[PDB]
Amino acid sequence: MGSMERASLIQKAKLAEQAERYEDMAAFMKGAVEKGEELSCEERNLLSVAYKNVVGGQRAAWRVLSSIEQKSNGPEVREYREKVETELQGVCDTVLGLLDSHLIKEAGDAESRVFYLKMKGDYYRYLAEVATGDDKKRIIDSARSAYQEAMDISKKEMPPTNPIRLGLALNFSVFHYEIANSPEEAISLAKTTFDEAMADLHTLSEDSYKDSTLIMQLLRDNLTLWT
């Protein structure tokens, strides 16, 4: 997308979201990132939404095929699961490449740095979901380290009701439960996150209250499932 204006890439990413063309959206935001300028709050959301949708569809397909493959155990089901798995890994590597070159190192504000580190944890978590071989433990630790650095910054620099801080804790708790085989850590994190946000709600406007309580409900939904 080197020949398109940055502002045109951003405008087309918003159009692609409206058209539910998330592969296009991701390619447009990849091009915008590669212009080399930092991303605004809205632009970070566009980047995240685009790739979350793309990899979300790949993960859903991988799970369908992995389930069929397990029930069977010719080569076709394994081959096609491997094909989807390789395409998912390629998308995850692309996102992680954008974060590493050079979104994270140029992110100085707490809101941008935590946002990108949460992203890094998420895409290593997606890699961990399909990993089996010599690198599954290293992939898991890469997810944990990214989430942990984001947690440390968010606790120092953001209020307990901040939606990015809340969504980071939500996803780190899912990491603990689904990936790290640490369900007690998952439950403790979700509960402490929920309780500290509840005690901070009194400080918020009506619109901020709606933003925070929406993510608190996701924490509560998981706790209900886990306890």
């Binding site: 959301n45 939404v49 979300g56 998420d122 939500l170 899912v174 996701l218 939904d221 499932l225």
Partner: peptide
């Protein structure tokens, strides 16, 4: 277990 849906913005 639900992560951030993060599919709309």
């Amino acid at each position: 277990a639900g992560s951030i849906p993060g599919r709309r913005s």
